[PDB]
Amino acid sequence: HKCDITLQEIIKDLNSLTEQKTLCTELTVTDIFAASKNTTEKETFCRAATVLRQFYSHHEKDTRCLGATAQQFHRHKQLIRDLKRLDRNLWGLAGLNSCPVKEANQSTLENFLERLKTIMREKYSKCSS
């Protein structure tokens, strides 16, 4: 389970998401990586899945995000779809819903996603030769 191809599905989701730089991706999430470092891998996935679910739930219909042009609206729908896909995969890996996130620091979604990508690539690296 630990080195399951779900890791690749998550990295794929993150690669697409981290191309986005919009008003929406500058909006913030609670910075789960501002912690002093005290949770299991399962708990880390639960934390990340929780904040991203908060984000897409709150911003799927947000006027700052929805877009004026066809291209902007398309990119917004893609962002929400990919956030849901990534979230689905993170929950699968977490196997837990109970992981209260306490951090004060807010980071942009953009920076949060780049950090998660780093962590996920590290896990992948630790799984392969």
Author numbering: 1 to 129
The authors write:
Interleukin 4 (IL-4) is a pleiotropic cytokine that plays a major regulatory role in the immune system. Signal transduction of IL-4 is mediated by a sequential binding process, initiated first by binding of IL-4 to its high-affinity single membrane spanning receptor chain IL-4Rα. This intermediate ligand receptor complex then recruits one of two possible low-affinity receptor subunits, the common gamma chain (γc) or the IL-13Rα1 chain, into the functional hetero-trimeric complex to initiate signalling. The overall structure of IL-4 comprises the known four-helical bundle in up-up-down-down topology, which like the crystal packing is unaffected by these mutations.
